[PDB]
Design a protein around this ligand. Sequence first.
Ligand SMILES: NC(=O)c1ccc[n+]([C@@H]2O[C@H](COP(=O)([O-])OP(=O)(O)OC[C@H]3O[C@@H](n4cnc5c(N)ncnc54)[C@H](O)[C@@H]3O)[C@@H](O)[C@H]2O)c1
Ligand SMILES: Cn1nc(C(F)(F)F)cc1-c1ccccc1CO
Ligand SMILES: [Zn+2]
Length: 282
Amino acid sequence: ERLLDELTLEGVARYMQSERCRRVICLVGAGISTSAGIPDFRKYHLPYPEAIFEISYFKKHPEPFFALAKELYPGQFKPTICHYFMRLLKDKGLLLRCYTQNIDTLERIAGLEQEDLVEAHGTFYTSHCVSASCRHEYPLSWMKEKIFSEVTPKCEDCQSLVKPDIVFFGESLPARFFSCMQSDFLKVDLLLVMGTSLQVQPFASLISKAPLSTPRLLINKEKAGQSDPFLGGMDFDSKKAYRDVAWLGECDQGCLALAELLGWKKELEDLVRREHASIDAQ
Ligand SMILES: NC(=O)c1ccc[n+]([C@@H]2O[C@H](COP(=O)([O-])OP(=O)(O)OC[C@H]3O[C@@H](n4cnc5c(N)ncnc54)[C@H](O)[C@@H]3O)[C@@H](O)[C@H]2O)c1
Ligand SMILES: Cn1nc(C(F)(F)F)cc1-c1ccccc1CO
Ligand SMILES: [Zn+2]
């Protein structure tokens, strides 16, 4: 009946190395970056505490946002074992797409390219002048220098405010999300959900966009995605369970176990160690 021979990580690895599994979509959240030192990120006289992340207030008073940005700026941008496992998926020719709710750029530092990524909530990687007639793009280095010097970032062409490409409250989701969703989920063979509680919509509903036969593996500290008894959910434990698997623990250790099952543990170790060595050497 089912594509997985058993509702275990071993069954998922066997399915992955079968000829049936060619296209893997990753859905990742804050949990895949806590081991990197980036925790769950989410005087100025704010009218309401959400104003610091609402677009209108930012364009009126951006200084609070950038003060918070200096306070939260990471001491290092070192992706995790999980990030590099996704890079390995890319190298092995199995990665259809990575949908991320994170803005910390670690997916790109790990070697995932823009075509590989749907950054559902944007990113700090790129910033743009807020003027529609200009839209000058600035890199993260420029923005970091502005934030650390405590100088509000202004466009060099038109002197307008420059905003990191994260999706503020009152901004729309990137259209790439919907277009890529409509195409990708016709093609997915395996859904790999890592480090997210699947509570924020519409990113959570993504799991219901997979075909009914598509196996779905959750690597997370706690079970998530099951239908809420109060209000296509994950079914790990019922007698009708057939495709959903939960590996409970650190995302790094779950990806290590999966790589070991796949025979990739040495490749993953070498990749992580060389990339971390190059980051430390900057
Ligand atoms: N780094 C970031 O970019 C970041 C951080 C915090 C919040 N957010 C915002 O939160 C929203 C998305 O929510 P979400 O689902 O990503 O977060 P969430 O807090 O709802 O879920 C994260 C999940 O990961 C688990 N987890 C944490 N550390 C883990 C680890 N080391 N190993 C395994 N599991 C671990 C947590 O227990 C939790 O179940 C977006 O609005 C996003 O902008 C982003
Ligand atoms: C500097 N900064 N500022 C914010 C905000 F103000 F929007 F919350 C988020 C971040 C940021 C940037 C890069 C990596 C990780 C994070 C989140 O810890
Ligand atoms: Zn400009």
